[PDB]
Design a protein around this ligand. Structure first.
Ligand SMILES: Cc1cc2nc3c(=O)[nH]c(=O)nc-3n(C[C@H](O)[C@H](O)[C@H](O)COP(=O)(O)O)c2cc1C
Ligand SMILES: Cc1cc2nc3c(=O)[nH]c(=O)nc-3n(C[C@H](O)[C@H](O)[C@H](O)COP(=O)(O)O)c2cc1C
Ligand SMILES: N[C@@H](Cc1cc(I)c(O)c(I)c1)C(=O)O
Ligand SMILES: N[C@@H](Cc1cc(I)c(O)c(I)c1)C(=O)O
Lengths: 221, 220
């Protein structure tokens, strides 16, 4: 059924629009995945306000196919760390394949993940690959992966705006074990882990360049 | 290859963090998919900046596997409308199946898509399923769909921040036809299509409510 209201919208005059879009670009452009996170405590309000932000993503036919699992318990965080090192280490020695580990080299990345223990909160984003109403019939979540991914793009923006850092991780093959560990139901699958907090004093990043605009944008006549 | 540098953070005193993260939530919450786009011209510098924003996304092994095809030419915009409308008609009639079609009544969409002609900008996000080294050899794009989608998330944030509207659309079975029409290379696949501009004077949205925090978040 559902009815249809007018849309009220807030416009800015063209000059203001430009300002806000340069500035927002200049802000997002400082976002860098950080793999070295201070142990220092983050305000729980903020973590909430960024998850809230993520939950404003669009989603196939309005299905909102996403769960955000927040872990700050030092002992559950450790248990996650165990599952992921065990798996990542197999992924590096063999599972990923030679080509993938080669391609990874430059980032100086290994199966050791200090941050899963040091980061004050983790965020595990789970997609719901279908759902159930209160009625208990299966519902279809169209384009669930894209939807949750967008939402997730929204998370990254809110974190960077709120002055927190993270890295977007997809720990290969740790899905099923983390589901079970975290008591998530069978219709939910892990899509990303994000460790959240302040960068560590000694935090570094790989000196990578983003592509020039004329290499992501094509105008067509 | 490599090179690793000290990372420079720009920190905020906690009170300010709650304030910024609340405002940014409120800001984002006023975004809705809008399917009635006015034909007013929008400024390029802005479309540009929302794309620069979208391009600052993370990506699997720093592959950046995204191409944003911007189309403002009315002729071309029209030929996109023909293709899509032709195909969504089939989609609604025979091809999406009954369940899906029903799931969509509440939103009052069909295969007529006027914003394809009306809107002053179309943005087609394509994902690069693989790419090419400077030296011409194939390189793998790890998690390209998630990477491109994420970028797309930042693009939606950037549109919103800037006072424009759109509607994330997935034109099922339009992929190939639009690819060739827009001249794109074989290794590119259309993800999503965004008609961008201001809302029409008349513009509606369905009256949907969003989940509350405790229906999406779970602490352990
Ligand atoms: C990936 C995905 C696919 C979508 N595909 C379409 C579509 O093909 N046609 C359309 O009108 N809207 C599409 N949308 C818009 C959604 O229907 C919209 O977000 C949802 O109905 C709730 O709307 P909201 O943005 O106002 O919160 C899509 C959204 C998502 C994220
Ligand atoms: C979906 C996808 C998967 C990723 N997986 C990992 C990963 O598992 N481990 C890791 O350290 N970083 C991962 N990242 C972070 C990227 O390596 C990083 O985004 C890329 O090198 C560019 O770095 P930047 O975010 O600072 O721009 C992933 C990013 C994307 C979008
Ligand atoms: N892409 C088609 C069908 C469609 C409508 C909506 I609303 C939606 O959320 C999804 I998934 C698909 C169209 O544009 O009408
Ligand atoms: N997930 C592993 C390996 C990995 C590293 C990077 I850097 C990356 O972009 C991707 I795709 C995979 C790890 O976290 O070490």
């Amino acid at each position: 059924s559902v009815e249809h209201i007018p849309f009220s919208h807030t416009r800015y005059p063209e000059q203001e629009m430009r300002m806000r879009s340069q500035e927002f670009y200049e802000l997002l452009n400082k976002r860098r995945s950080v793999r070295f996170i201070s142990s220092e405590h983050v305000p729980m309000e903020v973590i909430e306000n960024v998850i809230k932000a993520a939950g404003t993503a669009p989603s196939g036919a309005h299905t909102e196919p996403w769960t955000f699992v927040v872990v700050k318990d030092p002992d559950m965080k450790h248990k996650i760390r165990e599952i992921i090192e065990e798996e990542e280490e197999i992924n590096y020695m063999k599972r990923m394949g030679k080509r993938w580990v080669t391609d990874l080299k430059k980032l100086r990345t290994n199966w050791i993940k200090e941050y899963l223990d040091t980061a004050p909160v983790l965020i595990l984003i789970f997609k719901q690959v279908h759902g159930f109403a209160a009625n208990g019939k299966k519902k279809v979540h169209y384009y669930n992966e894209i939807s949750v991914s967008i939402a997730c793009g929204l998370l990254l923006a809110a974190l960077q705006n709120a002055g927190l850092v993270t890295v977007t991780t997809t720990p290969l093959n740790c899905g099923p074990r983390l589901r079970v560990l975290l008591g998530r139901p069978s219709h939910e699958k892990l899509l990303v882990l994000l460790p959240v907090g302040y960068p560590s004093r000694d935090a570094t990043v790989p000196d990578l360049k983003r592509k020039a605009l004329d290499q992501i944008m094509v105008t067509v006549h």
